[PDB]
Design an enzyme around this catalytic site. Structure first.
Site, PDB file in Angstrom:
ATOM      1  CD  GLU A   1      21.157  15.040  56.775  1.00 11.73           C
ATOM      2  OE1 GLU A   1      20.983  15.401  55.494  1.00 11.73           O
ATOM      3  OE2 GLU A   1      21.195  15.713  57.696  1.00 11.73           O
TER       4      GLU A   1
ATOM      5  N   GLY B   1      20.397  13.607  70.005  1.00 11.70           N
ATOM      6  CA  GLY B   1      21.687  14.240  69.953  1.00 11.70           C
ATOM      7  C   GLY B   1      21.840  15.606  70.310  1.00 11.70           C
TER       8      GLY B   1
ATOM      9  CG  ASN C   1      24.109  19.885  66.290  1.00 14.60           C
ATOM     10  OD1 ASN C   1      24.480  20.689  67.192  1.00 14.60           O
ATOM     11  ND2 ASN C   1      24.660  19.638  65.286  1.00 14.60           N
TER      12      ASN C   1
ATOM     13  CD  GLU D   1      23.823  14.218  73.398  1.00 12.39           C
ATOM     14  OE1 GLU D   1      24.482  15.134  73.365  1.00 12.39           O
ATOM     15  OE2 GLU D   1      24.303  13.121  73.425  1.00 12.39           O
ATOM     16  CE1 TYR D   2      23.909  17.316  77.924  1.00  9.74           C
ATOM     17  CE2 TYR D   2      23.794  14.911  77.760  1.00  9.74           C
ATOM     18  CZ  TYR D   2      24.507  16.151  77.561  1.00  9.74           C
ATOM     19  OH  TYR D   2      25.786  15.998  76.928  1.00  9.74           O
TER      20      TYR D   2
ATOM     21  CB  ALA E   1      33.334   7.493  79.258  1.00  5.03           C
ATOM     22  CE1 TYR E   2      30.569  10.777  73.779  1.00  3.42           C
ATOM     23  CE2 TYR E   2      31.699   8.807  73.859  1.00  3.42           C
ATOM     24  CZ  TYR E   2      30.693   9.488  73.475  1.00  3.42           C
ATOM     25  OH  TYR E   2      29.690   8.949  72.843  1.00  3.42           O
ATOM     26  CG  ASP E   3      32.085  15.161  74.506  1.00  7.06           C
ATOM     27  OD1 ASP E   3      32.778  15.421  73.672  1.00  7.06           O
ATOM     28  OD2 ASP E   3      30.842  14.847  74.034  1.00  7.06           O
TER      29      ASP E   3
ATOM     30  CD1 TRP F   1      30.976  10.885  68.501  1.00  3.16           C
ATOM     31  CD2 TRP F   1      29.242  10.104  68.553  1.00  3.16           C
ATOM     32  NE1 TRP F   1      30.362  11.749  67.608  1.00  3.16           N
ATOM     33  CE2 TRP F   1      29.038  11.246  67.651  1.00  3.16           C
ATOM     34  CE3 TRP F   1      28.205   9.480  68.657  1.00  3.16           C
ATOM     35  CZ2 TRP F   1      27.929  11.605  67.095  1.00  3.16           C
ATOM     36  CZ3 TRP F   1      26.673   9.593  68.065  1.00  3.16           C
ATOM     37  CH2 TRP F   1      26.673  10.854  67.315  1.00  3.16           C
TER      38      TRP F   1
END
Length: 369
Positions: free
Chosen positions: A49, A77, A79, A119-120, A190-192, A337
């Site tokens: 950025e 990340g 994206n 990722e990944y 530990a999500y998605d 996150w």
């Protein structure tokens, strides 16, 4: 205990009270603050950025106020994808270029370490050879960080990685026992676990399975993910349990079937601030007007619906449950996150500033005295 928190360098572009600015950073909320994200240019660490170097100095301002705080810079990340990682790890020369650039960049901007968020390896377009090349990258970084500390006499740079919870991605990319020797800590995402890519409702971050689940589905929960990473060779002290301050949303096929496992026709309506169909920040879901909230009994987490919209998210109670769990398992702490998806400015949920992340800090007994 650690409390590892991600800052995101695009949250500054949200509107109104959802805009996350440097004034919203709290130097003593977390023990470790990770900056998402750096990128890569010709195999060298680089900003993403226009004002990252302004924001890097804001990070250094925090360490002046809380001299215990550690900062790390995350690369990658979702994206960012995989090609630049694949190209950089393809040869020892390119890895060396990257490693040398990383040490110099981190020291220049006074970061305490690097968080790898590819990722990944082995998935998302990355070839199978990247599983072993990722192992080598991790060792190269760890060894170079150890060497640099020896020669410079400076505090050794930390190396962490953000890692997936699902067996498909774990086994395609991660030589868990090898990389565990070299990572200072492991930020388990530990999500998605479920989301609007699936044709039935399911929770973003359930703690245990639902009784109707079997086969592979029975491992798409936090406890199974934790046990997976422990049994495959991660020391408990190094495993940091990720926590989401957001939920995942669905449009229901019918407002008259709001079960967990009910048919869905796609992503939930985008949130007014986050503007991404299929997810909502905690501050978009915490006081949802005219909605109906309840808990998924075996999974220990809430969901909420309103008309044909259905959202699985985490609340104060589920964060407490998950910290009790991580303590029972002897884990090294919690990761979250992200800062900007909690109600960081106390604008929405009538629970004060950072209600979810302060819950983590309290339950970990990390409140400053």
């Amino acid at each position: 205990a650690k409390l590892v928190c991600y800052f995101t360098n695009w949250a500054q572009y949200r509107q109104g009270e959802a805009r996350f600015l440097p004034k919203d950073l709290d130097p003593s909320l977390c023990t470790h603050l990770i900056y998402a994200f750096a990128g890569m240019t010709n195999h060298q660490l680089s900003t993403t950025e226009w004002n990252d170097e302004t924001l890097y100095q804001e990070f250094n301002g925090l360490k002046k106020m809380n001299p215990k705080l550690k900062t790390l810079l995350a690369i990658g990340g979702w994206n960012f994808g995989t090609q630049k990682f694949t190209d950089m790890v393809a040869t020892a020369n390119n890895r060396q270029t990257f490693v040398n650039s990383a040490i110099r960049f981190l020291r220049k901007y006074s970061f305490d370490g690097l968080d790898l968020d590819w990722e990944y390896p082995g998935s998302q377009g990355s070839p199978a050879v990247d599983k072993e090349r990722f192992t080598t990258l991790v060792q190269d970084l760890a060894n170079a960080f150890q060497q640099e500390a020896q020669t410079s006499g400076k505090e050794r740079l930390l190396l962490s990685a953000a890692v997936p919870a699902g067996q498909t991605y774990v086994d395609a990319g991660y030589e868990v026992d090898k990389i565990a020797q070299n990572l200072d800590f492991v930020n388990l995402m530990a999500y998605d676990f479920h989301g609007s890519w699936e044709k039935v409702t399911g929770h973003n971050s359930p703690l245990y399975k639902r009784q109707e689940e079997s086969g592979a589905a029975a491992s798409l929960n936090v406890d199974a993910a934790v046990q997976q990473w422990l049994q495959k060779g991660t020391p408990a002290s190094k495993l940091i349990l990720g926590m989401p301050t957001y939920g995942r949303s669905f449009t229901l096929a019918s407002s008259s079937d709001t079960r967990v496992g009910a048919p869905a026709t796609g992503s939930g309506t985008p949130g007014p601030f986050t503007k991404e169909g299929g997810m909502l920040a905690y501050y978009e879901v915490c006081s949802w007007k005219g909605a109906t909230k309840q808990r998924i009994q075996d999974q220990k987490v809430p969901y909420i619906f309103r008309d044909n919209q259905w959202v699985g998210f985490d609340d104060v109670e589920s964060f407490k449950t998950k910290v009790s769990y991580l303590k029972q398992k002897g884990l090294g702490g919690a990761m979250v996150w992200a800062l900007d998806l909690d109600d960081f400015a106390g604008f929405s949920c009538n629970q004060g500033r950072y209600p979810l992340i302060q819950t983590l800090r309290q339950e970990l007994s990390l409140v400053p005295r």
